[PDB]
Amino acid sequence: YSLATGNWGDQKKAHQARAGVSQVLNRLTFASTLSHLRRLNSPIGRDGKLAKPRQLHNTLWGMVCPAETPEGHAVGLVKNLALMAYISVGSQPSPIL
Amino acid sequence: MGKRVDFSARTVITPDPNLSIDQVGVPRSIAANMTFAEIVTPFNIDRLQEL
Amino acid sequence: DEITPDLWQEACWIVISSYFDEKGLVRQQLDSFDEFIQMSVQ
Amino acid sequence: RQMDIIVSEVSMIRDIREREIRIYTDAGRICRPLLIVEKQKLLLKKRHIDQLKEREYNNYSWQDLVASGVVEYIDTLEEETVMLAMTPDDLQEKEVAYCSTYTHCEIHPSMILGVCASIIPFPDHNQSPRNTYQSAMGKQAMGVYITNFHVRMDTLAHVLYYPQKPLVTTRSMEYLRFRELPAGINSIVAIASYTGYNQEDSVIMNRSAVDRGFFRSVFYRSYKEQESKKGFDQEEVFEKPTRETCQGMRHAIYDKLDDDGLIAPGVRVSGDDVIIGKTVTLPRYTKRDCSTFLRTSETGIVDQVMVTLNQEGYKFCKIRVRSVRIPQIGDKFASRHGQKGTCGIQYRQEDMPFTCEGITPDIIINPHAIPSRMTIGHLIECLQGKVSANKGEIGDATPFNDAVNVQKISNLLSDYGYHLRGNEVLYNGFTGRKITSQIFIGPTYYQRLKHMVDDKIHSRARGPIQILNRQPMEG
Amino acid sequence: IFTVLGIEAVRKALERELYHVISFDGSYVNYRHLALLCDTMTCRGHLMAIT
Amino acid sequence: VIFNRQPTLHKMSMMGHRVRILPWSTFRLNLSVTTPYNADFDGDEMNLHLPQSLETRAEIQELAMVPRMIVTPQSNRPVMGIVQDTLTAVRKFTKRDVFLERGEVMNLLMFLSTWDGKVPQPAILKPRPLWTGKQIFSLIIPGHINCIRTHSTHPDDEDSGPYKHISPGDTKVVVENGELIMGILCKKSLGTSAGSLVHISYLEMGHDITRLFYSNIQTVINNWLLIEGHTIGIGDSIADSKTYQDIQNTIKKAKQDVIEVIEKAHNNELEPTPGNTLRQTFENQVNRILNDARDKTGSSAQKSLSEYNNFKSMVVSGAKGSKINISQVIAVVGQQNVEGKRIPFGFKHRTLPHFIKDDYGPESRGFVENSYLAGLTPTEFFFHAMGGREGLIDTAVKTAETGY
Amino acid sequence: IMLRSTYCLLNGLTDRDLCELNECPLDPGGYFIINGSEKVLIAQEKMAT
Amino acid sequence: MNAPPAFESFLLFEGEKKITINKDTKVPNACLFTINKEDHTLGNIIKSQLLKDPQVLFAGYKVPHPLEHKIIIRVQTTPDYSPQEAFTNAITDLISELSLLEERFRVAIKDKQEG
Amino acid sequence: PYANQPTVRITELTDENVKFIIENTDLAVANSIRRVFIAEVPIIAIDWVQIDANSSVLHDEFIAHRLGLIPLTSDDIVDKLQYSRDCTCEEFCPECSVEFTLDVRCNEDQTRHVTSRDLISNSPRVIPVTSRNEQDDILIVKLRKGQELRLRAYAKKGFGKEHAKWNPTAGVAFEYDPDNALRHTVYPKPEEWPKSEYSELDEDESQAPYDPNGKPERFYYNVESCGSLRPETIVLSALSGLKKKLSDLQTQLSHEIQSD
Amino acid sequence: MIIPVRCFTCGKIVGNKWEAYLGLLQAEYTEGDALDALGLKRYCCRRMLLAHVDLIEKLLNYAPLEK
Amino acid sequence: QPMIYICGECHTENEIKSRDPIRCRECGYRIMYKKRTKRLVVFDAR
RNA sequence: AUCGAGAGGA
Ligand SMILES: [Mg+2]
Ligand SMILES: [Zn+2]
Ligand SMILES: [Zn+2]
Ligand SMILES: [Zn+2]
C-alpha cells in the first residue's frame, strides 16, 4: 500500500502520513527516468513562502545539480543528485571505536 | 462567484501576422462543436434552412 | 609519472568513465535497498 | 585511504578552532569523489591512467583507484575542512600563489551538474534560468524512453521515429546513455525573421522535412480491463454485446470486436469506438453493457492485445492502441537551452529560404528569442554543429573547456568555405531574391516535447454536467 | 499619521505612500485609481484595512 | 467571441474578437494583441467564450472589442503597440537610407488595406525612381495626425545646438498631416507609451482607424522584412580585440582596486562612513568599485558595436533586450547577488571549498568577470546559478501573495 | 524488491540475458513494481541526528 | 484533427473558380484578379511580367493568408489599355518565354550529351 | 511589353545532377522555375500500402511512410499515367498507378535486410532507383529470424506540393549575382565572406563594384536528382509544367473575360 | 530507430548509405572521409549519417512474438 | 469462432474458448497475445 | 463516478 500510494505510513493514519514518497516512475524519455531515479526532495512544504530552504546553498556544490529543479511551486525543494554524487549507505562504528 | 460554463473552448495559441488585431483564428473543429442559437425570420429563413 | 596538462583532459575523463563503469547512475537506490535487506530487516 | 577498518564512506572532520573531531558512519550523507593531492601534486599518476585505459582486460576498476589512496569520497561536512583545486593547473606554482596547500582536486568541474543539465551543450554560456528550464524540458522530450518498448503496456508512451544523437555533445552524455537512447533530432536551424510566423517564442517548420519523417512520433496508449466475478449477484464478462440483451448500449457499432469481446490488432479505431465489449449481469435483460471505449478524439490503430489473469485470477486484458503524431502547428519544440516554442506555420521546401547550395532550414526561430534570454550556448552550439557536420565529428560542448572557444570554432568553420561566424546568404523562397541580412543558420539539436496541441484542444457546447451542482464537468 | 493628524491627513499620506510604491520602479498609474482606493480606505472616518 | 488568458489581471485580459475560421487546431492571434494578454507562443493556451444571445453579442461588440481596448484607463496610454519583428523592422525601415524600388513599393502597397490606390511620387526621381520607407509609412499612417517623438538614440545635446530641425542621425520623429516627415520609428513612437503614434491615432482617429493602422503596419513591415531580413548569431556577440583588451584592462583595474581596499581594511586603514558599520562600508566600497567596472566594460562593449549588429538593432528598436544584456553577452556578466548581497559564506568563512578562508575578493564572492560568449568558470557558473535561483524563487513566491 | 538489486532475478544477468527476458539492458533499475506500476522512492531530506 | 488534405492547396473545390475579375473602384482602369489554388509561383512571374508592360501603372500580388490557397493580383493600366488585356499579354509573354527556354534547354542538353 | 529571350548554357550534365545557367530572364521567372523543380514536377511514388503481415520491429505506418519515400523511376511513365483524380476507373488501374509487392521472411539466424530490391513491380519501367541496373539499395527494415513483412503497395502520380515524396530533387542550388554587384546583400564585413564558385574576381577584391543600373540576370542552377527522373528531365518537366499551368490560367481567364 | 530514407532537409536518399558508411568506418576511414566517399556534400546529409543511432539493432535483440 | 492466441513465452499457436482460464498448453504461461486481424487496413505512405 | 495523491503546463 505505502509503495503504491506514496502515503508513507500506516494506512489508517492516511492524513498524518506524508505523501509524495514513492512516485510513479517517469517513463517519458530515458533522461526523465534517470532523473526521477536520482530525485531528492526537501519536505519543507510547498505552501511555505520562505525562500531560504529554496535557495541554492553553497554546500550543494558537487552534491546537487545547480540547475535541475522544477520552476513551479517547488522550486529548490525538489532537487537532483550531481553525477558523481553518492549517498552513503551507512556502516558500523565498532571497528573505528 | 466562478463556475464552469458551456460554449467555451480552449487550445494552444499561435501567431498570425495576417489577422487584424480584432480577429481570432479558430479551428473548424472548435467552430463545428460550438454553436450559436440564431432566431428564424423571413430575413434569414433561406440561409438558416440551408444550415 | 605525473599526468601532464596535455594528457589531463582525457586522464580525468578516463577516471570518470571508470566510476560510471563501477557505480552507474542509480547506485544509491540499489545500495540503500541492499543494505536494508542484508541488515535492516534482520 | 588504505581500505582498512575505516570504510570509504566514513566522514572524518577535524574542526581546528574548536577542538572537535567528528566522525560519521551513518547513512544518508551525500558525498562525492575527489582526487587527493600530495604536497602540491596529484596522487593520480600516469600509471593509474594506464591501468584504467585497459580496464576491460586487467580488471583494474574504479574501486582499485579508491583502494590505491588516490581518490577519496568527501561529504559536505568534510568539504568545510578541504582545500579544493578546480583543476591540476591550480596546483601549479604561480607568480603569486593563491593557496599552495591544496588537499584535493576536482575530477572534473562539469560533474557538478545532474543528469538533465549534463545534456546542455555549453551551459556556461547560457543564463542560468535557461539551463533550469532545459533541465525541466529534457524530461518532456520525446525519444526512445526504453529499448524494450514493444513489450511494455504503458498507459502513455511517445517514441520518436528517427532519434539522432546530437552533433554537439558533452562528455557526460556518454554515461547518461543519451547517445544510445537520444531524445531529439539535429535540425538545420536558421535564426531569422521570416513572414512573422515565429514571433514571440514560436518556430516555422519545414513542411517537406516533416513529410520526410522529421520529428514524427508514435503515441502508444494502453487500456486496461478486467471482468470481475466478485459474486453471484453480478458478474462481468468479455463478449461482443448484442442490441437485444444489453441495456446500456451506446449507439456506437461493436462490429470491430471479436467473439471474445476484444478488438483485434491492426484494426483502425476512431474516437468513441469500442475496443473491449464487457457485459455485467443484471440482478436489455439479464446483462448490461459496460464496454470500454477509446478516449475520445484519438483515432489510432490497435497495436496489440494481451490477455492474462490478474493476481486474484479473473481475465485481464490490455490493449495498446497506436497513433502516429506528425508535427503540426501548435506542437511544442525546444532546443537544449530553454528556447521553447510552438510551431507557428509549416512551409514547403520551395517556400522556405535557401542558401546558395539549396539548403533550407528545417526550423526557423525568431532572433528576438536570443537577446533577453542570453542563450549564447544556442548560438555556439549552432556554430559548433556546423563545424561538426562539415568535419565529420561530434562536437565537444563540455561546460568548462578552455580548449574550445568561439574563435577556434569560427576558424575551423572558415576552413570549410563558410562565413566564420555561421552566417550565410539566404534567398527568399517566395521571390528568390537575396535577403539583405545574412542569416545565421546551422545544425542545432531540437527536441519534440510531449505537449502536442491535439492533446490540448477542447471545446464544449451543452455537454454533461456534474451531479451535485448542475454545472459543466471538469476536463 | 491617522492618530496624530487625522483622517484627511492619512488619506493624503496614504495616497503618497501608495504612489511611492507604484512609481518607484518607474511605473505610472492614473491618479483616480489611487484616489478611489484611498477614499474606500478612509471614507468611514477610520482606517479601513483591505482585509 | 470573448478571448481570455489566465491569470485575468485587468480588463484587457478578456477582449472581444471576430472569428476567422482557419485550417489547423490552434487559436491564431495577432501579434500586437499579445501584450495585453501577456501571452507568448511557448505553449500558452487561451479560452474562447461564445456569447449566446444578440444582447450579449451587442454588449461585447460595443464594450469589449479589441479596438475599443487599445488605450487602457490604468495609465491613459495604449496597452498594445508594435511588437518584436514589426518593431525591429520598422526601425530598420524608417532609417534615412532605405530606398525602395518600383516593384518593391507595389508589393508593399498590396498589403495596405487603407490605400487609396494612388502610388505616391517617389522621393527620388532620377537617376532612378526610389521611394523611401518613411514615404510608405506615411501611407500607413492614418488621418492627418501630428506627432513629435525622439528615437531612442537621440543625443541629448542635439536639441540645443544647430540641426534641431534637420537631425544628422534621423532621430526626432516628426509626423505632420499624417506623413512621416522625418525620424526613425521605434518603441518610443509605436510602442505602448503615452503620446506615441498609436495613442495619437486612437485619440484623433477612432478605434476602427487605429485597428487598421496596427494591421497595416504589421502587414507592410513584415512583407518588407521578407526582403530586408533580420537575424542574430555569433558575429553579433563578438567584439574587436581592441574592445576585448580594453574590457580586460578595466576588469584588472577593478580587481586590483578591490585588492587595494581589502588591504586597507586588513590593516585598519579604513574608517567607517556615517550610517554604516565597517563591514557595511567595506561592502559598499567593493560593490561600487565592481559596479563601476561593470558599467565601464558595458560602455566599451556598447561603443564597439556597429550598426550592422543585430543585438543593437533589437535594442534600439526596443523590440527586445537591453544594453545590460549586450554588456553581459559581450563584456562581463558581473556581480551575482543573493538577497541583495554578494555570495554568502555558506561554508566556514568560504563561499566554496576552492577559496581560502576570509576571501572578500571579487572572484570569491561572486563576480563573474567573463561574458556569456567567453563562458563562465565553474565557480562563476555556480554563483550565477545561485543568483538565477533567487530570481526563480522570487517569481514563484510573489504570485500567491500578489494575487491575494 | 527493487529491480536490479542484489535479490532481483535480473541481478548479474548479461545484456543477452536481459533481452532474452524482454528487459532493456539500458534500464537502470532502482524501482519497484507494485501492481504492475513502476514506483520510485524519492530520497527525503531530513535534518541530521 | 484539423489538418487539411495536402491536395486542397492545388485542387479546386466544386463550384469555385480558378480566377475571378473584379473592378477596383479606388482608381480607374484597375482590376483585382483573385486566383484560387495558386501561390507565389505564378503570382510572382505574372506580376514581374506585368511590370515589364509600360502601359501597366501598377502590378502587385499578395497571398492574403499562407494557410489559404489563393492569390490576389492587382493590375492598373493606362486609360487606353485594360488590366484584363495586360494580364492576358503577360501570360502570353510568359508562355512564349518558357517555350523558348524549353527549346533552348533541349538544344543545350542535345549538345552536352554529344558535345 | 513582351517576353524575355532567355538563353541557356549547361556547364555540367551527369546522371546525378545538371548544372546550368539561364541568362537574360527575370528573377521571378528564375525563382518560379526553381520552385517548380521542387513542387510541380510530377513523379511516381508509393502512396497506398496494404500490410498483409508485419512481424518487424517497426509498426505499419513506419513501413508505409518509409516505402513512400523510396524513389521510383518515373522518366517516361509519369507523362503517360493519369492522376487518380482524373482516371475514370475504380480505386486503381494500370492507367493511373503501379503495383508493387514485397514479401520477405527471415529464416536464417542472421539479420535479413529488407531493401528496396525486394519491392517487386508489375511495371518494368517503374522500379526503385537503386534497383535499376555501386550504390546499395535503400533499407526498408531489418528482420530477425522469425520476423516477416508482406505488403502490397500502389504508386501514383503527384508532385512535391502534395508531399515531399513526390519531390524529384535532392537539392536545388540556385544563385545569381555571385559578386554582390546589385548589393541585394549588404555584407557588414565583405572581406570575411568566401567567394562563390561562380565568382569572377581577383582575390584582393571582396565584392564587385556596385551596379546602379543592373538587375538580376544570369541565374546559376544546380539541380540534383533524387533518382526518379533525370535532372534534365526534371528541368524539362518543370518548364512544361510551369508553362502549362500558365496555359490553364489563360484558358480560365479567357472564359472569365468572355462571361463578363 | 533505422536510417531515414531521405535527408530531412534536401531530400537526398541516405537510406542506402548506412551500411556502406559502417563498412567504411571499420575500414579505418574517418567519419568525414567516409561521408566524403559516399557523396554527402551538404552538411545536412552529413548530419543525417553522422548523427544516426541505429536503435533497430538493439530492437532485434528481442525474440519476435511468433516463432 | 476459434480466437487463437499466441504465447508470450513459447510463441505457440493455441485456441482458447471463452470461460477458460488463460494458460498456454505448451508451457503454462499466463500471458497471451491476439493475432493480427485479417481485415484490410490501408495506409497512405505519407 | 467520487475522493485523495502525485507529476506536469502557462
Ligand atoms: Mg507563455
Ligand atoms: Zn485508374
Ligand atoms: Zn541533405
Ligand atoms: Zn506457451
* DSSP result, F179-225: EEEE----HHHHSSSTTSHHHHHHHHS-HHHHHHHHHHHHHHHHHHH
Q: How far apart are CA D453 and CA D297, in angstroms?
A: 12
Instruction: Note down the domain range covering J34.
Output: 1-67
In terms of Cβ atoms closer than 10 Å to its own Cβ (0-12, 13-18, 19+), residue F55 is exposed
Helix (H) or strand (E) segment spanning residue F246: helix F241-266
Please name the residue that has the C-alpha cell 512583407: F223
- Among residues I40, I70, I235, I59, the alpha carbon closest in space to that of I165 is found at I70
Nearest-by-CA chain H residue for D296: H1
Nearest-by-CA chain F residue for I213: F128
Q: Could you tell me the CA-to-CA distances from F270 to F275, F280, F282, F349 in Å, in that order?
A: 15, 12, 8, 21
Please name the residue that has the C-alpha cell 505602448: F192
- Among residues F398, J56, F274, F152, the alpha carbon closest in space to that of D147 is found at J56
- How far, in whole angstroms, is CA A49 from its chain's centroid? 19
Q: How far apart are CA D450 and CA D142, in angstroms?
A: 7
Looking at domain F84-228, which CATH architecture does it have? Orthogonal Bundle (1.10)
Give the list of residues 6+ apart from residue I213 with CB closer than 8 angstroms, or none.
none
Contact A87 C19 (CB under 8 A): no
Question: Per CA to C1' distance, which residue is closest to L10?
Answer: F44
CB D332 within 8 A of CB D205: no
- CB-to-strand L under 7 Å, chain A 45-64: none
Using the Cα atoms of residue G6, residue G9, residue G14 and residue G18 in order, give the sign of their dihedral. Answer: negative
Quote the Cα angle for G39-G44-G47, to 5°.
170
For chain I, how big is the Rg over CA atoms in Å? 23
SS3 helix, strand, coil % of chain D, rounded to 5? 20, 30, 50
**D466 Cβ within 7 A of any nucleic strand L atom:** yes
Q: How far apart are CA H58 and CA H76, in angstroms?
A: 5
Q: How far apart are CA I37 and CA I41, in angstroms?
A: 6
Min Cα distance A33 → chain F (Å) is: 23
How far in angstroms lies nucleotide L2's C1' from the CA of residue D413? Answer: 63
The b-or-e profile of K11-22 (16+ CB within 10 A means b, else e) is bbeeebeeeeeb
Using the Cα atoms of residue F386, residue F387, residue F390 and residue F391 in order, give the sign of their dihedral. Answer: negative
* Residue pairs between chains D and I whose CB atoms are closer than 8 Å: 101
- What's F234's DSSP letter? G
**SS3 per-residue string spanning E3-49:** CCCCHHHHHHHHHHHHHHHHHCCCCCCCHHHHHHHHHHCCCCCCCCC
Cell readout for F29 is 492571434
Cell readout for I28 is 521571378
Q: Could you tell me the CA-to-CA distances from F354 to A83, D82, F283, I3, I180 in Å, in that order?
A: 19, 8, 22, 76, 54
Cell readout for D37 is 593531492
Ordered DSSP codes for F18-64: EEEEESSSSEEE-STTHHHHT--SSS-EEEEE---SHHHHHHHHHHS
Torsion of CA F282, F285, F288, F292, to 10 degrees: -130
Dist. CA I94 → ligand 2 center (Å): 6
**A43 Cβ within 7 A of any nucleic strand L atom:** no
3-class secondary structure, I226: coil
The partner residues of D36 in beta bridges, in order of sequence, read D104
Is F116 known as a binding-site position? no
Dist. CA F29 → ligand 1 center (Å): 13
- Among residues G34, A37, C21, A62, the alpha carbon closest in space to that of D139 is found at A37
> Phi first, then psi: what are they for F268, rounded to 5°?
60, 25
A77: which nucleotide lies closest, measuring CA to C1'?
A: L7
- Among residues D170, D169, D177, D172, the alpha carbon closest in space to that of D147 is found at D177
CB A32 within 8 A of CB D144: no
> Phi first, then psi: what are they for D296, rounded to 5°?
-60, 145
Dist. CA I98 → ligand 2 center (Å): 10
HSE-CB at D31 with a 13 A cutoff on CA atoms is: 25
HSE-CB at D160 with a 13 A cutoff on CA atoms is: 33
- What's D78's DSSP letter? H
Torsion of CA D189, D190, D193, D194, to 10 degrees: -80
CB I162 within 8 A of CB I108: no
Q: How far apart are CA D58 and CA F131, in angstroms?
A: 79
Contact A4 G45 (CB under 8 A): no
> Phi first, then psi: what are they for I49, rounded to 5°?
-130, 145
Dist. CA I218 → ligand 3 center (Å): 26
Contact G2 C24 (CB under 8 A): no
CB D185 within 8 A of CB D331: no
By what technique were these coordinates determined?
cryo-EM
In terms of Cβ atoms closer than 10 Å to its own Cβ (0-12, 13-18, 19+), residue C41 is exposed
Helix (H) or strand (E) segment spanning residue C9: helix C5-22
Per-domain boundaries in chain H? 1-115
How far in angstroms lies nucleotide L6's C1' from the CA of residue A14? Answer: 15
Sheet holding H19-23, edge to edge: H19-23, H30-36, H70-77, H56-62
CB D24 within 8 A of CB D10: yes
In terms of Cβ atoms closer than 10 Å to its own Cβ (0-12, 13-18, 19+), residue H72 is middle
Q: Which nucleotides of L are covered by protein (CB under 7 A)?
A: 1-2, 4-10
Give the list of residues 6+ apart from residue D98 with CB closer than 8 angstroms, or none.
D90, F356
Q: What is the CATH number of the domain that holds K11?
A: 2.20.28.30
- Number of Cβ within a 10 Å radius of residue D26: 15
| H1-115 under CATH 3.40.50.2000, yes or no | no
Resolution for the entry shown, Å: 2.6
Torsion of CA I208, I212, I218, I224, to 10 degrees: 70
Is J43 known as a binding-site position? no
> Phi first, then psi: what are they for E8, rounded to 5°?
-75, -35
Dist. CA A42 → ligand 4 center (Å): 48
At what angle are helices F102-109 and H40-51 packed, to 10 degrees? Answer: 130
Mutate to test the interface with B, among F14, F48, F210 (most CBs of B within 10 A): F48
- How far, in whole angstroms, is CA H100 from its chain's centroid? 19
> Phi first, then psi: what are they for H54, rounded to 5°?
-70, -20
Contacts of J59 in chain G (CB under 8 A): none
CB G29 within 8 A of CB C26: yes
CB F43 within 8 A of CB D137: no
Give alpha helix (H) positions in I50-123. Answer: 60-68
The partner residues of D305 in beta bridges, in order of sequence, read D319
Contacts of G16 in chain J (CB under 8 A): 61
Cell readout for I170 is 535532392
Fold of the domain spanning I43-164: RNA Polymerase Alpha Subunit; Chain A, domain 2 (2.170.120)
Quote the Cα angle for D217-D219-D221, to 5°.
170
Using the Cα atoms of residue D170, residue D176, residue D177 and residue D183 in order, give the sign of their dihedral. Answer: negative
Contact J64 I55 (CB under 8 A): yes
User: From the DSSP assignment, how many helices (H) and strands (E) are in chain A?
Assistant: 2, 4
Cell readout for F128 is 532612378
**How many structural domains is chain K composed of?**
1
Q: Could you tell me the CA-to-CA distances from F171 to F96, F184, F211, F228, H19 in Å, in that order?
A: 10, 6, 26, 21, 47
Catalytic-role residue among D124, D201, D258, D272: D201
Annotated catalytic, D201? Answer: yes
Paired sense of beta strands G32-34 and I139-143, if any: unpaired
- Number of Cβ within a 10 Å radius of residue F324: 13
Please name the residue that has the C-alpha cell 541568362: I23
3-class secondary structure, D185: strand
- Among residues H42, J49, J47, H106, the alpha carbon closest in space to that of I18 is found at H106
Q: How far apart are CA J31 and CA H100, in angstroms?
A: 46
Q: How far apart are CA D188 and CA D445, in angstroms?
A: 9
Cell readout for F269 is 586603514
Which residue from F43, F231, F372 is facing D191, i.e. has the nearest CB? F231
Q: What is the CATH number of the domain that holds J32?
A: 1.10.10.60
SS3 helix, strand, coil % of chain B, rounded to 5? 25, 25, 50
- Number of Cβ within a 10 Å radius of residue D18: 5
**How many structural domains is chain J composed of?**
1
Q: How far apart are CA I205 and CA D272, in angstroms?
A: 70
How far in angstroms lies nucleotide L7's C1' from the CA of residue A20? Answer: 10
| Residues with Cβ–ion distance below 5 A, ligand 2 | I 87, 89, 93, 95-96
3-class secondary structure, C3: coil
How far in angstroms lies nucleotide L8's C1' from the CA of residue D213? Answer: 27
> Phi first, then psi: what are they for H10, rounded to 5°?
-115, -20
CB F270 within 8 A of CB F286: no
Per-domain boundaries in chain I? 1-42+165-260, 43-164
- How far, in whole angstroms, is CA F293 from its chain's centroid? 24
**D155 Cβ within 7 A of any nucleic strand L atom:** no
CB D113 within 8 A of CB A84: no
- Number of Cβ within a 10 Å radius of residue I1: 14
User: From the DSSP assignment, how many helices (H) and strands (E) are in chain D?
Assistant: 8, 26
Give the list of residues 6+ apart from residue F8 with CB closer than 8 angstroms, or none.
F14
For chain G, how big is the Rg over CA atoms in Å? 14
Q: Could you tell me the CA-to-CA distances from I260 to H20, I246, I257 in Å, in that order?
A: 10, 21, 5
User: In residues, how long is chain D?
Assistant: 475
CB D416 within 8 A of CB D387: yes
CB J40 within 8 A of CB J16: no
Min Cα distance I251 → chain J (Å) is: 35
CB F143 within 8 A of CB F201: yes
- Among residues A7, A81, A87, the alpha carbon closest in space to that of A41 is found at A81
Give the list of residues 6+ apart from residue H114 with CB closer than 8 angstroms, or none.
none
Q: Which CATH superfamily is domain I1-42+165-260 in?
A: RNA polymerase, RBP11-like subunit (3.30.1360.10)
Instruction: Note down the domain range covering K39.
Output: 3-46
Amino acid letter, residue H106: R
Going along chain I, which residue ranges are E strands?
7-13, 17-23, 43-54, 97-105, 112-115, 120-121, 139-143, 148-158, 169-176, 219-225
Helix (H) or strand (E) segment spanning residue D218: strand D217-226
Q: How far apart are CA I200 and CA I160, in angstroms?
A: 35
The partner residues of E6 in beta bridges, in order of sequence, read none
Quote the Cα angle for I239-I242-I247, to 5°.
120
Q: How far apart are CA D295 and CA D326, in angstroms?
A: 19
Q: How far apart are CA D444 and CA D60, in angstroms?
A: 39
> Phi first, then psi: what are they for D208, rounded to 5°?
-65, -45
